[PDB]
Amino acid sequence: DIVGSEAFQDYVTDPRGLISKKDFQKAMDSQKQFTGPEIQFLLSCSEA
Amino acid sequence: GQWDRLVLNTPSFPSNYWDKFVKRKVLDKHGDIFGRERIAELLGM
Numbered sequence A: 001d002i003v004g005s006e007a008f009q010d011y012v013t014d015p016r017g018l019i020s021k022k023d024f025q026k027a028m029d030s031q032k033q034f035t036g037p038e039i040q041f042l043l044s045c046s047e048a
Numbered sequence B: 001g002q003w004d005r006l007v008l009n010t011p012s013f014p015s016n017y018w019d020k021f022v023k024r025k026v027l028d029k030h031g032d033i034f035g036r037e038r039i040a041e042l043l044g045m
Helices: A021-030 A038-044 B002-006 B022-026 B039-043
Strands: none
Touching: A021 A038, B022 B039
C-alpha cells in the first residue's frame, strides 16, 4: 500500500523505477507509518 | 460536490460555522501520508 501511494512518485527519478537505497531510507521515513529499526531490515531484504 | 471546489483556496472558509481550525486539523490527520506541502497548497495555507 505504501509503494502504490503518490508519495513514491516524488522519489522515483530513474526511467526503470530503480530507487536508490539512500533515497528509499528517507522515503519510508517520510511516510511515517513504520517504526525505527524495521526500515533497515527491509533494506537487507532487497537486492543491491 | 463539484461546485464546491471553488472555495477551499479561500482565506475565509469557515465564515460562519464555528471553527477556524479545521484547516489545521486536516493538515494533520490525512496530511502526513500525502504531501504536507501538497495539501497545504490545496487549502492555501
